[PDB]
Design a protein around this ligand. Structure first.
Ligand code: ADP
Ligand code: CL
Ligand code: CL
Ligand code: MG
Length: 414
C-alpha cells in the first residue's frame, strides 16, 4: 500500500509559471496577466447561506490560476491543465442561459453575467487555467474558477470593482450567476464570498441576510492555528461523486412559507432571543406539517446558533468547546439534514477516536471532504488512520490537504 497522499498548494511562482506556459502553448500570444482565487473550507455554518444564516469559511492556500487576455471580439476560448489539448470555444453575442456545454460554462458565464449586469465594455477573452484545488471534492473548485475569472475580467476591462471588499460583491454576484444560470448548478454564495473576501489568518463570519451592505455582512475573525498549537486536518474522502440539494432548499423555502417568514434566519433569531429556547423551537416545529421538514428546520436553527458559539469559543481559546461545536454541526448534518454518507461519517469517527478536538464534513455533503481540529503535528497520523480504515472498508483511498486561513483572490502577475 502507499502512504496517504497530501496535495501541496502551488506557490505563487509555480501557479504563475504554469498558467502562463499553458496560455502561450495554447494561444501563442502572452497573457495580459495571471490572477488566482482559492478553494475554501467552511469551518461551521452549513446549509445556512441560502437560509440567510451565518457561515464561517476560510480560504485554502490551494488556488486556481487564470492567465487571461481580453479580445476585441465576443469569442471566449478557455483551456485547463486537466485536459490541456482540449480548447473550449463559445461566443458571448446572443448567448443565453445554459447556452454553454461543460466546464467552460463556469468562465464563459462570468463574462455573460457581467454583460447582463450592463457592463457593455466586457467583450471576449482567451484564458488558460492551472489549479491545485481538486475538482468535485467539496473544496469549491467551482468558485475558484468563477472568482479568478471575475477578478481577471474586472481588471483587464477596468470595471473598478476588484480593488475593494465592497466592490468585490459585484464580482461575486457575477460568479454566482455564472454557476446558477450558465452552468446550471445551484450555489448559495458561501463559496464565492470565501474565495474573494477571506483574509490570511482569519475566518470570514458571513451574515447571509440579503438586505445587508458589504461592510455590514462580514467580520474577520482571528483564526491563528499556531497561537493554540493546532492543525486543521482536511481529508478529501474521494467517495464516489453524486436533486437532493434542490429538495433541501425546497423544504427550507416551504418551512419559511408555512411559518410566514421571509427566511429561516428570522425563525432562528426569534428562537435564539427567547429565554426558553427549547420551548421556542418546539412551538416552531409544531407548526410544521411533517417530521422531515421539522428535522431540516431544527438543523438550520441550531446551526446558526452554533456559528456564534464557535466564534466565541475560538476567541476564548476554548478549543475543546470549539471542537464540540464542530462535532454537533456534523451530527446535525448526519441525523437532521441527512446529507452525510458512510465515508464522511467513518472519517469523522476515526478523527474523533484518535484525539481530534472535533471533526465534521464540510461543504454541501453527499461526499467530499471532512475537517478536524487536531494538535499540531497529528494531522498526518490521523489522515493515515483514516486511509487504513478506508482500505479495511473497501473505500477509495482518501487524500489530505494542508490547510490554514489563507489570502483571497488576487492578481498574481501583469
Ligand atoms: N481546474 C479546472 N479545470 C476545468 N474545469 C474545472 C476546474 N475546476 C473546476 N472545474 C469545473 O467545475 C466542476 C467542479 O465544480 P463542483 O461540481 O461545483 O465541485 P467543487 O466545487 O466541490 O470542486 C468541474 O466538474 C468542472 O466542470
Ligand atoms: Cl455583442
Ligand atoms: Cl428535504
Ligand atoms: Mg462547487
Amino acid at each position: 500500500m502507499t502512504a496517504v497522499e497530501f496535495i501541496e498548494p502551488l506557490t505563487h511562482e509555480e501557479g504563475v509559471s504554469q498558467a502562463t506556459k499553458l496560455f502561450v502553448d495554447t494561444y501563442g500570444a502572452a497573457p495580459e496577466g495571471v490572477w488566482a482565487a482559492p478553494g475554501r473550507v467552511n469551518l461551521i455554518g452549513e446549509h445556512t447561506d441560502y437560509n440567510a444564516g451565518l457561515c464561517l469559511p476560510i480560504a485554502l492556500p490551494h488556488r486556481t490560476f487564470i492567465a487571461l487576455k481580453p479580445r476585441e471580439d465576443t469569442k471566449v476560448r478557455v483551456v485547463s491543465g486537466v485536459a490541456p489539448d482540449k480548447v473550449a470555444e463559445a461566443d458571448l453575442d446572443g448567448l443565453k442561459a445554459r447556452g454553454v456545454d461543460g466546464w467552460s460554462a463556469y468562465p464563459t458565464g462570468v463574462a455573460w453575467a457581467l454583460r447582463q449586469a450592463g457592463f457593455d465594455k466586457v467583450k471576449g477573452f482567451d484564458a488558460a487555467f492551472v489549479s491545485c484545488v481538486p475538482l468535485g471534492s467539496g473544496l469549491s473548485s467551482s468558485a475558484a474558477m468563477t472568482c479568478s475569472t471575475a477578478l481577471a475580467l474586472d481588471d483587464v476591462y477596468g470595471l473598478g470593482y476588484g480593488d475593494s471588499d465592497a466592490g468585490r460583491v459585484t464580482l461575486i454576484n457575477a460568479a454566482i450567476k455564472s454557476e446558477n444560470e450558465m452552468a446550471g448548478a445551484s450555489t448559495g454564495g458561501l463559496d464565492q464570498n470565501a474565495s474573494m473576501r477571506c483574509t490570511e489568518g482569519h475566518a470570514l463570519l458571513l451574515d447571509c441576510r440579503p438586505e445587508l451592505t458589504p461592510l455590514e455582512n462580514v467580520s474577520q475573525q482571528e483564526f491563528d492555528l499556531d497561537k493554540y498549537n493546532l492543525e486543521l486536518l482536511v481529508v478529501d474522502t474521494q467517495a464516489p461523486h453524486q436533486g437532493q440539494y434542490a429538495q433541501r432548499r425546497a423544504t427550507c423555502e416551504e418551512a419559511a412559507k408555512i411559518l410566514g417568514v421571509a427566511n429561516l434566519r428570522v425563525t432562528a433569531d426569534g428562537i435564539s432571543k427567547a429565554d426558553d429556547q427549547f420551548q421556542a423551537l418546539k412551538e416552531t416545529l409544531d407548526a410544521l406539517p411533517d417530521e422531515t421538514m421539522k428535522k431540516r428546520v431544527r438543523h438550520v436553527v441550531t446551526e446558526i446558533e452554533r456559528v456564534r458559539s464557535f466564534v466565541r469559543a475560538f476567541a476564548q481559546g476554548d478549543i475543546k468547546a470549539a471542537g464540540r461545536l464542530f462535532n454537533a454541526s456534523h451530527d446535525s448534518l448526519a441525523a437532521d439534514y441527512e446529507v452525510t454518507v458512510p465515508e464522511l461519517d467513518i472519517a469523522v469517527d476515526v478523527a474523533r477516536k484518535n484525539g481530534a478536538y472535533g471533526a465534521r464534513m464540510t461543504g454541501g455533503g453527499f461526499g467530499g471532504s471532512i475537517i478536524a481540529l487536531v494538535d499540531k503535528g497529528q494531522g498526518h497520523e490521523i489522515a493515515q488512520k483514516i486511509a487504513d480504515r478506508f482500505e479495511k472498508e473497501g473505500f477509495n483511498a482518501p487524500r489530505a490537504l494542508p490547510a490554514f486561513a489563507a489570502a483571497s483572490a488576487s492578481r498574481e502577475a501583469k
